[PDB]
Every structure is written in C-alpha cells, then in structure tokens.
Design a binder for these strands. Structure first.
Ligand SMILES: Cc1cc2nc3c(=O)[nH]c(=O)nc-3n(C[C@H](O)[C@H](O)[C@H](O)COP(=O)(O)OP(=O)(O)OC[C@H]3O[C@@H](n4cnc5c(N)ncnc54)[C@H](O)[C@@H]3O)c2cc1C
Length: 455
DNA sequence: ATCGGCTCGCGCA
DNA sequence: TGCGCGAAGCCGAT
C-alpha cells in the first residue's frame, strides 16, 4: 500500500505477505493488456519508485488458446505487438512466457530475483487456481489490483447480488470516490520470446478454422485490434453514436452500439476511461443513463456474479425458482431438437436464429439484442437445460471476440437460468423463464433486413 | 408484517 | 411505433 494522491489503496489487496526483495517489481499482466489507464501497472510503477527499482511486465501465454479459434488469437497477439512497442517507449521491458502460469511465473520470479509481484484481477476460476499455485511457490509479497472495474469488485459488494436494482444503488454510492482521472505512466529510470514467432507457431496450430462450402468465414477487417484502435472506436461512438444509443441500441439493423466489448474483454481500453469521457459528453441524457447502466452496472455485476458463484457456468448457479421450473419441464416434448453441430452451422428452421449465428460466425460479434434471442432458443430446442448451457457457452466462447468473459457467463445465465431476472408466464419446456419470440422481434425492428444482411 | 418494483408478449392509438 | 397492462417470484425498505 504505497503513497500517492491518485492512488486509492482500496483498489489493491495483498494475496501474500512477505519480505520485500531487492529486485524489480514484476507486473504479471493477464486481463488488462494496455499501458494507459491501468491501475495495476500504475501501482506497480509506484511501488517501484519507492524501492528505487525498475518495473517490468511479464505475460504468460497458456495453451488455452487452442480451445477457441484463430480469431481471438490474432486479435490478442496483434494487440500485444503494439503494447510491447508502447512499453518500450516508457523504458518498461516486457517478457512473454509460454506455459502454465503456475510453473512459469514462479520460475521467472526466482530467476530474475523479483522483489514484488503484482497482478490484475479476474473472477474466472482458472485465474484463482494459477494464483494459489504461485503463492505456494514464491517468498516475495504478492499483490492484486482491480484494473478492470471502476469500483473494485470486492468493494462494490460483499455478496452475490440478486438483481441490478439492488446493486445499482450500491455502485453509484461509490462512484464519487472511485471515478477519477488516471495519472500518466512515469517511465523507468533504472532499466521476451519473439511475439512474431508465437504468432506463427500457434496460428498453424489451428487447422480447425471455421470455413465454408473451403473459404474461411471470419472477416477480420471489422475491428482493428490494439490500444490505439480502441481509442478511435471510443471517440467515434461519442461523436456519432452516443446520441442515438438510447433509442437504437436494441435495433440490430443499425450499427449504433459502441463496439467496445472486444477491446474491453482483452483490457485494451479501460471502462473507467470510457465512463470518464461519456460523463463529460453533452449528449441526450436518456442515452447517457442507458449506456452508463450497461458499462457500469451490468458489466461489473457480471464480475460480481462470477466472483461469488464459482459454479457461474453451471445449472447450480441458477436461482431456485428457475431450477424448480426447468426441472419440472424436463420431460416436455420439445418442438425441435438440434445438436451442437446443427446450431453451430446455422441449420435451424428459424431464419432469424440462423442469421444471428451467421453474424457471429462472420463478424465475431453478435448484436446485443439477438444474443438474448440466440441463447433463449438454444434452451427451447435442446434436449435438456444442461445441454443448452453447454451449447450456448461453447458457441459463445468459440466465436465471440469478447467471449471467455464474465459478461458471457452472466449473460448466458440471464438468458437460460434467469440469473439477474425474474419469473414470467408459465410455458412448456421453458417454464417460467422469460420468453422471446420471432413475432416479438418483428414488432421492434426490421427482422427481414437483418436476415438478408447475413444470408 | 407487508407491499413496491423489477433490462418479455400483447392489444390498441 | 410508443404506451399500459399482464404474469409471476422474490428482494429489501418500511
Ligand atoms: C447470451 C449472451 C452472451 C453474452 N456474451 C457476452 C460476452 O461473451 N462478452 C461480453 O463482453 N458481453 C456479452 N454479453 C453482453 C452483451 O451482449 C455484450 O456486452 C454487448 O453486446 C457487447 O457489444 P457492445 O459493447 O458494442 O454493446 P454496448 O451497448 O456499446 O455496451 C457497452 C458495454 O456495456 C457492457 N454491457 C453491455 N451489455 C451487457 C450485458 N448484458 N452484460 C454485461 N455487460 C454488458 C459491455 O461491457 C459493453 O461492452 C452477452 C449477452 C448475452 C445475452
């Protein structure tokens, strides 16, 4: 807990007490891959300044990439190529390790005689597993910093929040303390495996790319990765799209969303930065309220969900009323039953669902509104709730650029299990889970135009 | 003990 | 297209 005027100590918490070593401060970067507006890197620099040592950044590439597609890999890697150059300009060296973070981070601390270890915060299961391994294998102090949420996850609330309307008041009460400008990253005054080689080695490791009847389906030109690109996407949203957001956010025929989720997922841009700029923008107040609710309440309540429910991707995490309902309807005759392969290919009877899948396959980002429709029909046309959850998670994390994310698990849990929702009218197969229909969409936007844009 | 109020479909201007 | 009601279980403020 070092000094600093803009260094709120509540953003940091110790994972391991220990004797501070004589070597550099190491920032094990995982979730927040950026140089600007990064509380984890800023704290690491602050601690370094106080101990008269340099700060270095270390990043561990795991074999997880093999589970989810070329498209996520290129986006991350191309971003990291930009990050390395950015950190070089500030005289901050970056090291890239390939292996199990459990093993590799421990050995790096020992070999480079690191004095203090800092990492960013993720509520996902696997990160806590790596952390506990690292703890068992080091002697130096080990700090965690929430660089992803405006209000630190463990400060916003101490329990799983049942609904946004109970969480909203708590989060906004803490905004005045935690919504603050970022100080500039001070360069080092003391002073890696080829990212280009990791790019090729693993891009060839993926022969199972999604193709077409043999042309590849992914279109990489829709989102340019990196920290610079993210800033441009933010500024064009404020300039051109924020004003209309309140009205057109749920019309998938209009590209009127922020398009920030891919950059937000990999932490190439801070949501605190986005919030700071949106707050100062003079736009329609209704649109502001709507957007802020999405990127503050719903984004950060998703971290709450995963942090306090370690089964966040299972039926157990559903609330009792949803479990009772879905259990009661397990034997109901489904009108249609499709396999993972058939959903994946877009071979259902519903042209709207198929179009949603085609947008996902081709762009890597399904519109917000149809994601709800998409997930809920998987529940409707699967043989069991467990199978639906599997299929939804599999397709989401495999094809969404912003997948493998708390927002994904919390969003699928809303669609299928009523997490952060309430009970609705009793139906068959879906019980009391909120229903969405083809006819409903027909009333809210030009379904025909969405279908034709994606075959 | 007890209400009020929560991010759909539907009928109607 | 925008509005007001319905159906439905529970949290938290009173
Ligand atoms: C079944 C399902 C799966 C989803 N999967 C993901 C996912 O894998 N990754 C992901 O980042 N989001 C997911 N979401 C939430 C939402 O769909 C996306 O965040 C949103 O579409 C991202 O596009 P955008 O930022 O251009 O939209 P915007 O309207 O510009 O929203 C801006 C930001 O607010 C946040 N946000 C918006 N909606 C939600 C939400 N429902 N929950 C949490 N945060 C939200 C996002 O951080 C988003 O980037 C999912 C929702 C559902 C219903």
């Amino acid at each position: 807990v070092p000094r600093g005027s803009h260094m709120n100590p509540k953003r940091i918490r110790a994972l391991k007490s220990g004797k501070q070593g004589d070597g550099p401060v190491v920032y094990w970067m995982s979730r927040d891959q950026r140089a600007e507006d990064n509380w984890a890197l800023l704290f690491s620099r602050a601690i370094a300044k106080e101990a008269n040592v340099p700060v270095v950044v270390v990043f561990c590439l795991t074999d997880e990439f093999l589970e989810a597609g070329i498209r996520q890999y290129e986006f991350m890697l191309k971003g990291l190529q930009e990050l390395e150059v950015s950190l070089s300009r500030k005289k901050i060296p970056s090291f890239f390790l390939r292996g199990d973070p459990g093993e590799k981070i421990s050995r790096f601390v020992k070999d480079y005689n690191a004095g203090t270890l800092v990492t960013d915060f993720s509520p996902l299961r696997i990160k806590n597993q790596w952390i506990e391994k690292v703890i068992s294998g080091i002697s130096i102090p080990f700090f965690e910093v929430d660089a992803h949420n405006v209000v630190p996850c463990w400060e916003a609330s101490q329990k799983h929040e049942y609904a946004a309307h109970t969480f909203r008041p708590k989060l906004y009460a803490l905004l005045p303390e935690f919504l603050e400008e970022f100080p500039e990253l001070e360069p080092n005054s003391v002073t890696e495996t080829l990212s280009d080689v990791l790019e090729t080695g693993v891009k060839a490791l993926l022969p199972e790319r999604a193709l077409l009847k043999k042309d590849p389906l992914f279109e990489p030109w829709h989102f340019e990765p990196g920290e610079k690109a993210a800033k441009k996407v933010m500024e064009s949203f404020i300039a051109d799209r924020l004003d209309s957001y309140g009205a057109l956010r749920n019309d998938p025929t209009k590209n009127m969303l922020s398009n920030l989720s891919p950059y937000l997922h990999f932490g190439q841009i801070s949501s605190q930065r986005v919030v700071l700029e949106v707050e100062k923008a003079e736009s329609n107040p209704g649109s502001k309220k709507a957007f802020l609710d999405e990127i503050l309440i719903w984004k950060e309540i998703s971290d709450n969900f995963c942090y306090y429910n370690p089964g966040y991707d299972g039926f157990e995490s559903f609330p009792s009323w949803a479990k009772e309902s879905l259990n009661a309807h397990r034997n109901d005759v489904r009108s249609h039953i499709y396999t993972l392969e058939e959903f994946e290919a877009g071979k259902t009877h519903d042209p709207l669902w198929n179009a949603s899948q085609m947008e996902l396959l081709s762009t890597g980002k399904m519109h917000g509104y149809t994601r709800m429709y998409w997930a809920k029909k998987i529940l409707e046309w699967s043989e069991s709730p467990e199978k639906a959850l599997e299929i939804a998670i599999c397709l989401n994390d495999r094809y969404e650029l912003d997948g493998r994310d708390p927002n994904g698990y919390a969003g699928i849990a809303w669609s299928i299990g009523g997490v952060h929702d309430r009970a609705w009218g009793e139906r068959e197969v879906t019980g009391k889970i909120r229903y969405m229909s083809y006819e409903g969409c027909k009333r809210k936007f030009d379904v025909k135009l969405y279908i034709e844009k994606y075959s």
